[PDB]
C-alpha cells in the first residue's frame, strides 16, 4: 500500500501468467474485433504531413481519410495471414523477415 | 471485304527512324495488338474519368491524364512533350 | 510522420493477424512497405483530385485509386 | 488500299472538332512536364551482342530461320 488505503494493500499479489495461453486468449479476443484499431487522429496527421509535398491547399474530407484508413487496415491483415502461414510452414513459429519476403515474392509485388 | 490497319503509317514512322530496317510479319502483329490495347485502355480510362468528373467536356486533358495514370513517368512525360509540341504546332 | 503506426499499434495489428510470437526486428520493414503503399495511394489521390483540379479530396478519389490499383475495397 | 483509308482519315479529321461545346484546352496548354528530355524524336541508343545480356539481367533464327524467312517483308 502506497498510503492510506482500504485497510491493508498488496492484494494484487504475484499472479504472472505464462505466455502461450495468454497469447491464445488475446488472439481469440482480437479476431472477433471488427472495428478500427489504430488511432485515427495520428493517421490523418501523418497523411496530411505527407500530402503537401505534391501541393498544399489540397484539403480533405472525413469520407476520404476514413476510406484510406479502411484501405490500409484491410490490406495488411491478409499480408499478416500470408506471413504467418509461410512462417509455420517452416519450423519457425515466430516471425522473421524471411517468410515476409517470401510472401512479397509470391504475391507479385511488381 | 476490306481491312483497315496501320501498315503504311508504321512503316513510314520506321523509315523516318530507321530507314534501312523494316518490320516483320509477327513483329507487326505484336505491335498492332499492343497499340490497339494501349488505345483502348486510354479511351476507356478517359471515358470513365470524364464520367467521374460529371462533365461532358472531353479535351486532350482527358487523354493526357490517362497517359499519366496508366503509364510510368518516362514514356508518359516524353509523349506529353511531343504531343504538346505537335498540338501547339497545329494550333 | 514516421512514427504514425506506433509499436503497440503494430503489435496489436499483428496479434489480430494471428501470429504466435512477433520478433522485435519485424516492424521496421512492415512500416516501410506500408509507407510506400500510402505514398502510392496518396499520389494517385492527388492526381485525380486534379482531374478537375478539385480543391478537396473525397472518398470518390481514394476509391478510384484503390479500384484501379488492383486492391479493391468495399463497404460503401 | 491505303489511299481510300487516307482520304477517309482526312475527311474525318474535321467532323470530331465541331461535336458541340468543346473549346479544347482554352487555346492554351502546359509546356513539357518535368524537364525536356525527348530529344529530336528518340534516344538514339543501341544494344550489344555479347554477354551484355548477362550484364543487363544483372542490371535490373527466332522460331528457326524457316520462320524467319516465313515472315514476309512488308511492302507499302
Amino acid at each position: 500500500a502506497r498510503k492510506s488505503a482500504p485497510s491493508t494493500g498488496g492484494v494484487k499479489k504475484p499472479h504472472r501468467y505464462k505466455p502461450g495461453t495468454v497469447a491464445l486468449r488475446e488472439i481469440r479476443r482480437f479476431q472477433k474485433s471488427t472495428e478500427l484499431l489504430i488511432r485515427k487522429l495520428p493517421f490523418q496527421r501523418l497523411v496530411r504531413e505527407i500530402a503537401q509535398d505534391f501541393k498544399t491547399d489540397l484539403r480533405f474530407q472525413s469520407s476520404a481519410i476514413g476510406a484510406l484508413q479502411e484501405s490500409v487496415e484491410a490490406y495488411l491483415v491478409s499480408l499478416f495471414e500470408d506471413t504467418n502461414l509461410a512462417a509455420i510452414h517452416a519450423k519457425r513459429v515466430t516471425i522473421m523477415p524471411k517468410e515476409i519476403q517470401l510472401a512479397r515474392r509470391l504475391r507479385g509485388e511488381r | 471485304a476490306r481491312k483497315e490497319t496501320y501498315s503504311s503509317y508504321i512503316y513510314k514512322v520506321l523509315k523516318q527512324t530507321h530507314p534501312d530496317t523494316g518490320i516483320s510479319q509477327k513483329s507487326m502483329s505484336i505491335l498492332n495488338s499492343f497499340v490497339n490495347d494501349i488505345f483502348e485502355r486510354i479511351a476507356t480510362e478517359a471515358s470513365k474519368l470524364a464520367a467521374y468528373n460529371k462533365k461532358s467536356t472531353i479535351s486532350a486533358r482527358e487523354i493526357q491524364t490517362a497517359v499519366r495514370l496508366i503509364l510510368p513517368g518516362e514514356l508518359a512525360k516524353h509523349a506529353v512533350c511531343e504531343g504538346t509540341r505537335a498540338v501547339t504546332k497545329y494550333s | 510522420n514516421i512514427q504514425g503506426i506506433t509499436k503497440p499499434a503494430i503489435r496489436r495489428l499483428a496479434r489480430r493477424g494471428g501470429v504466435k510470437r512477433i520478433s522485435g526486428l519485424i516492424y521496421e520493414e512492415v512500416r516501410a512497405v506500408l509507407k510506400s503503399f500510402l505514398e502510392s495511394v496518396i499520389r494517385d489521390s492527388v492526381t485525380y483530385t486534379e482531374h478537375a483540379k478539385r480543391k478537396t479530396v473525397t472518398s470518390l478519389d481514394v476509391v478510384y485509386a484503390l479500384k484501379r490499383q488492383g486492391r479493391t475495397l468495399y463497404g460503401f | 488500299e491505303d489511299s481510300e483509308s487516307d482520304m477517309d482519315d482526312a475527311k474525318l479529321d474535321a467532323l470530331m472538332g465541331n461535336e458541340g461545346e468543346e473549346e479544347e484546352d482554352d487555346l492554351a496548354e502546359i509546356d513539357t512536364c518535368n524537364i525536356i528530355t525527348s530529344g529530336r524524336r528518340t534516344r538514339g541508343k543501341v544494344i550489344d551482342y555479347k554477354k551484355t545480356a548477362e550484364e543487363l539481367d544483372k542490371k535490373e533464327e527466332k522460331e528457326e530461320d524457316d520462320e524467319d524467312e516465313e515472315d514476309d517483308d512488308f511492302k507499302e
Partner: peptide
C-alpha cells in the same frame, strides 16, 4: 451547395472548375 459548374456553363474556355466539396462551405459550415 453552390458548385462551380455555373462558371463552366457560362464560359466554355475552362470547364475544369466543375465540382467542389468545401468551396461552397454549405456542406461543412451551414
Amino acid at each position: 451547395f453552390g458548385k462551380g459548374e455555373e462558371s463552366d456553363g457560362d464560359l466554355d474556355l475552362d470547364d475544369s472548375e466543375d465540382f467542389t466539396v468545401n468551396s461552397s462551405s454549405v456542406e461543412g459550415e451551414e
